[PDB]
Nucleic acid binder design. Structure first.
Lengths: 134, 51, 182, 52, 84, 126
RNA sequence: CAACUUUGGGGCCGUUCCUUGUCUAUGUUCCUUGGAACAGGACGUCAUAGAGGGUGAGAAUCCCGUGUGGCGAGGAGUGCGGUUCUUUGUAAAGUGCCUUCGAAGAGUCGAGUUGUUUGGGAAUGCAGCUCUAAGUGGGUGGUAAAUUCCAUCUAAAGCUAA
RNA sequence: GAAAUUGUUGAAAGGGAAGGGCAUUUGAUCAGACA
RNA sequence: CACGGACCAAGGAGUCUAACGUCUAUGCGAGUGUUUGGGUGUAAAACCCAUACGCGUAAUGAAAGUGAACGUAGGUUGGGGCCUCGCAAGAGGUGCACAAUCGACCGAUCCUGAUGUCUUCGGAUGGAUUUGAGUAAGAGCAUAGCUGUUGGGACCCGAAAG
RNA sequence: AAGCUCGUAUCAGUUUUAUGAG
């Protein structure tokens, strides 16, 4: 098992310092999953298509659940209309950071999410596919 | 708001003029990136050396 | 691919940078020698071969004899004036004919040519002419048009064209062998 | 002009400034906010008294 | 040379419209003023059908097309033009 | 600083171009300043040297001393002023090699060429 | 047939290019140590000059040089800018319309066979031997081989910058 | 101006071995603190 | 008792590169890559950049060639996490990824052979224990590091020979 | 070693019950 990360991105280490603390104190199973995802490498943090976000947003009772993606985010031309939700992730590409505000939704950071829904309340996680890998 | 910046002159004094920031200094600081750049960019001003 | 003795023949372009400076210095030298002229000959627009690239155009070698004559001058004066010529090239397309002619007309309008006798006015040269007469890829359609349909479905056309081409010799054989009956 | 802003696009070809991942480089301020601290069962002492 | 036939799925098919008239043609069913698209000028030689697309009638110009592709475009009310 | 392409910034070059330089260049390398009196007189700071010049010393152990040149030994980059000597043990005496960077002239031996030189270098001689 | 248009050759002097020669700032002030100050401290100065070297140890300011500009000297030189003397010229060139012709490289091209060579494969290139042509022709079109078209080109003679 | 190696002086030891390890004695030698 | 070792200093031996591959960090992220080259410069640097090219985004067959949604991009099961109920224990819904299974779609093999038709073309429909590393709301490109594989003298020295 | 799933987890160079082959 891992205990602390390989990277040197200082803000990434800072988020780890935060979410370790919440996983110590607050004990909701959301935070542990966040942290165990954050430690991982770039292959096993594959990106998340905004189209996939919409697919999982068409779930039942899945209209205002703030989606969370520890990985990156990728715009997708393959769909044309998109909802207006609040979406948190590490790295929003510029295309999808344009698209989501174009829909009207907000593209939020992770620390602001920790403010808004610390315990993993009214949220959801996605982990992009990994056997499109070679 | 790009909050403020003050201005001096060639003899120096806090003038009545002032300015905002450019919203570039708000950009991050990634010293890992400076490290892995600088130690790939100081080597371009190199000549050969060979017996 | 090194089973041979490659180690004596290696080229290492350290001198990329130095060649660049020598090259720019040569440019400037030739231009200051050629002081009023633009350092480059006017080169035409041409539409490329090899259907992969046929959409493009390309700044070819030299304009033609016939297009020059359509402008109403001669090659002999052109190569003094700053214009190129190819002769082994032959025009079989009218839009290109017209475009090259248009370039020549623009050039003759856009220059001033000294006498042989002199009095040498102030000229304040330009460094290049490719910039001012840029090669320009043309329009094929404005963005907007109305739809029309023909009911052919645009796949069967290609398919039966293929069929006719591959069976042309045999359909000709059928036609000829029924034609030469009795 | 040169380096871009939210209003001037970049003045470079197909370039944007980078993206923060986080609102702020501090974490003490975050955790000393209130809506987080309401969601925190309290701490220990962080120096355990020796027993036996 | 002969073998330049780099595909384009019907999916992508509006990124060719750079960003801006994308909207202006999206909010339009215009059979009178429909956008023209140049697969060849964007560097694509044959259409293949993968995607699903709005019903907005829009013009397309290309050489090679498949049956589902032309069917979907005619379903939107667009049309193919078999330029060389 | 150096903003040119035909002059050296290298030790291995200039030590050679100092040591193995001709006498015609050592004439210039063995220059000397002038007294501020002569500076006010002639309108010039410095000069080359000559056999027949009077001079005063300003640095070294021999500070305060003065006299006339008897010889200029360019092959050691040195000058020999008389009344500045060291007694050998055997009663004989030796001249003293000095660099003319560490002297100051109070009187010269002018010639036609020297007047022309001072005119060439901003002369205010008379 | 028709009217039109346009030219040359010398010198002189600048300028450019090269070779250069030469000139172009500011402390050697005070104190300590030391054999010696270029070291330490103070007080100062010049700076399109603090690159470098030297001199009795790390010297911008002691020297030579650097920088910045200028001043001349000797050469190549038509590169063009002014000059100056000649006048070609009933020469030469370009220009459209009508007509007639339009000459266009041989032991070479090409074919066989031998050997070599190429990535070149049912035979690319080269050299040798043999046979050896045509002019509404001839080569070439990477799979053989008969036939017919199509496309592009004009060989066996040649020069030349970057 | 190092080392092998060599000499003089000073100290010490020594019966067919020397060198090393644990502890200590004898002799030489030695740093720190008392305020 | 197989070999080397008298003594000391100094030297003295897994590296450098090309092309592939994994793992990781980073930039951008359906895009990606400034550097063959142009411009600019305080000059081998740094800074900017046009247009093309590469890789990837569609595969498959001997190839001619063809070419990815029936469905809320399928169903069933398990599935982290979230939501609801409950003080709780547990129940229910949603159920990403991942895995299994059943299906579908594409490409190919075999069979049928429709509307029509230059009467010999064309390929509508539906089937096979057939198959692809495919499709099924994209994920790679580039650089550096660690080490790997092959070939380069290749951990160093040392073979007679041609 | 890197991931994914479990977590009290399937297990054991082991006995006992039962029953085989030998």
């Amino acid at each position: 098992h891992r205990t602390a990360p390989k990277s040197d991105n200082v803000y990434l280490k800072l988020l780890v310092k935060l979410y370790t603390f919440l996983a110590r104190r607050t004990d909701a199973p959301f935070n542990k999953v966040v942290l165990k995802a954050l430690f991982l490498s770039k292959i096993n943090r594959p990106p998340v298509s905004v189209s996939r976000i919409a697919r999982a947003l068409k779930q039942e009772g899945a209209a205002n659940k703030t989606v969370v993606v520890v990985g990156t985010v990728t715009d997708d031309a393959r769909i044309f209309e998109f909802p207006k939700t609040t979406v948190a992730a590490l790295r929003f590409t510029a295309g999808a950071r344009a698209k989501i505000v174009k829909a009207g939704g907000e593209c939020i950071t992770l620390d602001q999410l920790a403010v808004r829904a610390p315990k993993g309340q009214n949220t959801l996680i996605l982990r992009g596919p990994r056997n499109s890998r070679e | 708001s790009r909050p403020q910046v003050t201005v001096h002159s060639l003899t120096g004094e806090a003038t009545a003029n002032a300015l905002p920031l450019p919203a570039v200094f708000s950009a991050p600081i990634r010293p890992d990136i400076v490290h892995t750049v600088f130690t790939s960019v100081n080597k371009n001003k190199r000549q050969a050396y060979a017996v | 691919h090194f089973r041979k003795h490659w180690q004596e023949r290696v080229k290492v372009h350290f001198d990329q940078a130095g060649k660049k400076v020598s090259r720019r210095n040569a440019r400037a030298t030739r231009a200051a020698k050629i002081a009023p002229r633009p350092l480059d000959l006017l080169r035409p627009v041409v539409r490329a071969p090899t259907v992969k690239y046929n959409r493009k155009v390309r700044a070819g070698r030299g304009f033609t004899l016939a297009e020059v004559k359509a402008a109403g001058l001669t090659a002999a004066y052109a190569r003094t004036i700053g214009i190129a010529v190819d002769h082994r090239r032959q025009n079989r397309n009218q839009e290109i004919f017209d475009a090259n002619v248009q370039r020549l007309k623009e050039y003759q309008s856009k220059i001033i040519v000294f006498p042989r006798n002199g009095k040498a006015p102030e000229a304040e040269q330009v460094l290049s002419a490719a910039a001012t007469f840029p090669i320009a890829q043309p329009a094929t359609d404005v963005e907007a048009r109305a739809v029309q349909d023909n009911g052919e479905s645009a796949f069967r056309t290609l398919r039966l064209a293929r069929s006719e081409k591959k069976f042309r010799g045999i359909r000709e054989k059928r036609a000829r062998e029924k034609a030469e009956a009795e | 002009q040169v380096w871009g802003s939210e209003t001037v696009a970049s003045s470079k070809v197909g370039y944007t400034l980078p993206s923060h991942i986080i609102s702020t480089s501090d974490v003490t301020r975050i955790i000393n906010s209130s809506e987080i601290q309401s969601a925190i069962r309290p701490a220990g002492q962080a120096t355990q008294k020796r027993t036996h | 040379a002969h073998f330049w036939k780099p595909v384009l799925n019907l999916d992508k098919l509006w990124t060719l419209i750079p960003e801006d008239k994308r909207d202006q043609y999206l909010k339009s069913a215009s059979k009178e003023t429909a956008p023209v698209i140049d697969t060849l000028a964007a560097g694509y030689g044959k259409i293949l059908g993968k995607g699903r697309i709005p019903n907005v009638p829009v013009i397309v110009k290309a050489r090679f097309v498949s049956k589902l592709a032309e069917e979907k475009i005619r379903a939107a009310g667009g049309v193919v033009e078999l330029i060389a | 600083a150096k903003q040119s392409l035909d002059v050296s910034s290298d030790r291995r070059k200039a030590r050679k171009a100092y040591f193995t330089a001709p006498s015609s260049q050592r004439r210039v390398l063995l220059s000397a300043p002038l007294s501020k009196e002569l500076r006010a007189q002639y309108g010039i700071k410095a000069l080359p040297i000559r056999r027949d010049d009077e001079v005063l010393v300003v640095r070294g152990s021999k500070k305060g001393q003065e006299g006339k040149i008897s010889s200029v030994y360019r092959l050691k980059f040195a000058v020999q002023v008389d009344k500045v000597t060291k007694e050998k043990v055997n009663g004989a005496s030796v001249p003293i090699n000095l660099h003319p960077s560490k002297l100051v002239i109070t009187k010269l031996h002018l010639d036609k060429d020297r007047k022309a030189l001072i005119q060439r270098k901003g002369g205010k001689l008379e």
